[PDB]
Amino acid sequence: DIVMTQTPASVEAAVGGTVAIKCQASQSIRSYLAWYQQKPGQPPKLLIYEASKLASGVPSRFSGSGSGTQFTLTISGVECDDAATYYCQRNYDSYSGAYYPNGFGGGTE
């Protein structure tokens, strides 16, 4: 039913360099992708919602875009507070018509 694959596994960069993480889907989830940041020992922090909007409390270094079945999370520069894995969450159910946070793909640093 729900296919979500995060592909650029195990990517890291030196402070001042940049990174990006991307996810693909077999079903369109246009403008309904959420991104999370999980630091060890913490619950995931919401970073980006509806593909490109930042959540309150999210630093300006975070951004991203996408549509359809292709989406990317980008970091404008590493500030040494990026010690987290990131996750892709689907916020649209194509069978029920509801828009709730069902299903994850992810695990990339």
Task: Output 56 or 96, the one with its CB closest to other proteins.
Answer: 96
For residues 68 and 33, what is the distance between their CA atoms, to the nearest angstrom? 10
Nearer to other proteins (CB atom), residue 66 or residue 106: 66
Min CB(98)–other proteins separation in Å: 5
Distances (CA, A) of 37 to 23, 34, 68, 105: 15, 10, 22, 13
* In the complex, least distance from residue 14 CB atom to other proteins, rounded to whole angstroms: 41
Closest CB 42 distance from other proteins, rounded Å:
29
Which of 3, 15 has the CB closer to other proteins? 3
What is the binding site for other proteins (CB under 8 A)?
94-99
The counts of H helices and E strands in the chain are 0, 9
**106, 88 contact by CB (below 8 A):** yes
